[PDB]
Design an enzyme around this catalytic site. Structure first.
Site, PDB file in Angstrom:
ATOM      1  N   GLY A  32      -6.245   7.709  -3.064  1.00  0.00           N
ATOM      2  CA  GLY A  32      -4.936   6.872  -3.057  1.00  0.00           C
ATOM      3  C   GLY A  32      -4.143   6.823  -4.281  1.00  0.00           C
ATOM      4  O   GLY A  32      -4.182   7.857  -4.993  1.00  0.00           O
ATOM      5  N   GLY A  35      -6.504   6.005  -7.374  1.00  0.00           N
ATOM      6  CA  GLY A  35      -7.802   6.541  -7.718  1.00  0.00           C
ATOM      7  C   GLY A  35      -8.404   7.162  -6.278  1.00  0.00           C
ATOM      8  O   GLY A  35      -7.631   7.538  -5.455  1.00  0.00           O
ATOM      9  N   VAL A  37     -11.771   7.104  -3.235  1.00  0.00           N
ATOM     10  CA  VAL A  37     -12.503   6.189  -2.493  1.00  0.00           C
ATOM     11  C   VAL A  37     -13.809   7.179  -2.153  1.00  0.00           C
ATOM     12  O   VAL A  37     -13.770   8.216  -1.531  1.00  0.00           O
ATOM     13  CB  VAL A  37     -11.992   5.547  -1.335  1.00  0.00           C
ATOM     14  CG1 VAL A  37     -13.015   4.548  -0.815  1.00  0.00           C
ATOM     15  CG2 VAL A  37     -10.714   4.618  -1.803  1.00  0.00           C
ATOM     16  N   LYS A  52     -14.656   2.534  -4.969  1.00  0.00           N
ATOM     17  CA  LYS A  52     -13.235   2.838  -5.354  1.00  0.00           C
ATOM     18  C   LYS A  52     -13.304   3.014  -6.856  1.00  0.00           C
ATOM     19  O   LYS A  52     -13.867   2.143  -7.516  1.00  0.00           O
ATOM     20  CB  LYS A  52     -12.068   1.609  -5.342  1.00  0.00           C
ATOM     21  CG  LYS A  52     -10.587   2.071  -5.121  1.00  0.00           C
ATOM     22  CD  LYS A  52      -9.745   0.827  -4.801  1.00  0.00           C
ATOM     23  CE  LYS A  52      -8.313   1.294  -4.977  1.00  0.00           C
ATOM     24  NZ  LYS A  52      -7.583   0.364  -4.289  1.00  0.00           N
ATOM     25  N   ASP A 142       2.237  -3.639  -0.959  1.00  0.00           N
ATOM     26  CA  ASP A 142       1.903  -2.289  -0.555  1.00  0.00           C
ATOM     27  C   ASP A 142       1.367  -2.338   0.963  1.00  0.00           C
ATOM     28  O   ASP A 142       0.504  -1.704   1.450  1.00  0.00           O
ATOM     29  CB  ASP A 142       1.023  -1.369  -1.387  1.00  0.00           C
ATOM     30  CG  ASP A 142       1.381   0.114  -1.293  1.00  0.00           C
ATOM     31  OD1 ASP A 142       2.227   0.363  -0.827  1.00  0.00           O
ATOM     32  OD2 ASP A 142       0.518   0.761  -1.978  1.00  0.00           O
ATOM     33  N   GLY A 162      -4.431  -3.031  -5.212  1.00  0.00           N
ATOM     34  CA  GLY A 162      -4.272  -2.756  -6.687  1.00  0.00           C
ATOM     35  C   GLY A 162      -2.864  -3.275  -7.076  1.00  0.00           C
ATOM     36  O   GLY A 162      -2.547  -3.170  -8.204  1.00  0.00           O
TER      37      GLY A 162
END
EC number: 2.7.11.1
Lengths: 292, 9
Positions: A32, A35, A37, A52, A142, A162
């Site tokens: 992502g 970071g 997953v 994550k 997002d 996030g």
């Protein structure tokens, strides 16, 4: 700005320890913006969880990593991925969370066609989550198919918090440039103060994903697409002949340039298009393990 | 990385 200074701050808010003491067989499944997953196996049960992993050193805004903690501690809902624990592991923040084994909606929209019963089911589930978040002042910022995850039995859940932000009486609007270019609301690209309305616009762009397979201007560079979102009339479906008047009327309440005139999540829950929503079972055949 | 989130400068 020190890395070790931020590591120490994060240690004060996450759970103590290292989840490798109870997890086996980490396998990377996605990457992502912040970071990666992984799936992992709970050694005691054989159950699968998701982990994550976010490198503190690779973050553009490290302070947004606290969003994972704030959301885990205070906001839980049927249509929001559940987060179990957070840990500082070396230079990385690890969040152990619910594994959504059906994958992301992106894999569906890029490989098959959804019917309106399935589209209505996704929109109803997302709107139920957003109605509860927005009522508490939380903006996701997002919304896109990549942020929508599925269970094996077709339940739809919002993930990737996030980038969220909170508004309130003392902070009525946000000003930060945050989101994914093709999905950004025009008032956000215009750098005007904005509120929960930007998630509703982004949801509209996701509806275009579900009908057309890609967001508008996807063939254009991201900065070019942002200028077109900002300066042009609301983007059009490429296949307008493939949506019912009910879906078009629904989309018309989402892709409104003036955020004061855009529908809210609470209003959209009452829109007749959502009467078409199927049960989670109707989404099951769309997933990779089941389609042909 | 066309689908990746961006965070303003």
């Amino acid at each position: 700005v020190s890395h070790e200074q931020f590591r120490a701050a994060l240690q004060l808010v996450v759970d103590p320890g290292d989840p490798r003491s109870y997890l086996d067989n980490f396998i990377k499944i996605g990457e992502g913006s912040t970071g990666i997953v992984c799936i992992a196996t709970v050694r005691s049960s054989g159950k699968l969880v998701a982990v994550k992993k976010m490198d503190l050193r690779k973050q553009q805004r490290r302070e947004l990593l606290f969003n994972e903690v704030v959301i885990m501690r205070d906001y839980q809902h049927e249509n929001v991925v559940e987060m179990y624990n957070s840990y500082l592991v070396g230079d990385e923040l690890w969040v152990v969370m619910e594994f959504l084994e059906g994958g992301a909606l992106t894999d569906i929209v890029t490989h098959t066609r959804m019917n309106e019963e399935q589209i209505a089911a996704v929109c109803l589930a997302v709107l139920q989550a957003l109605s509860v978040l927005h009522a508490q002042g939380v903006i996701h910022r997002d919304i896109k198919s990549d942020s929508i995850l599925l269970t094996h039995d077709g339940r739809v859940k919002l993930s990737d918090f996030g980038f969220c932000a909170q508004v309130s009486k003392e902070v009525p609007r946000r000003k930060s440039l945050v989101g994914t270019p093709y999905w950004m609301a025009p008032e956000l690209i215009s750098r005007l103060p904005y509120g929960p309305e930007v998630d509703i616009w982004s949801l509209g762009i996701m509806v275009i994903e579900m009908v057309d397979g890609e967001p508008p201007y996807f063939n254009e560079p991201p900065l070019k697409a942002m200028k077109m979102i900002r300066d042009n009339l609301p983007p059009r479906l490429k296949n307008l002949h493939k949506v019912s008047p009910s879906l078009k009327g629904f989309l018309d309440r989402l892709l409104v340039r003036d955020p004061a005139q855009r529908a809210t999540a609470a209003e959209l829950l009452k829109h007749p298009f959502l009467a078409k929503a199927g049960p989670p079972a109707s989404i099951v055949p769309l997933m990779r393990q089941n389609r042909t | 990385k066309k689908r990746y989130t961006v965070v303003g400068n």
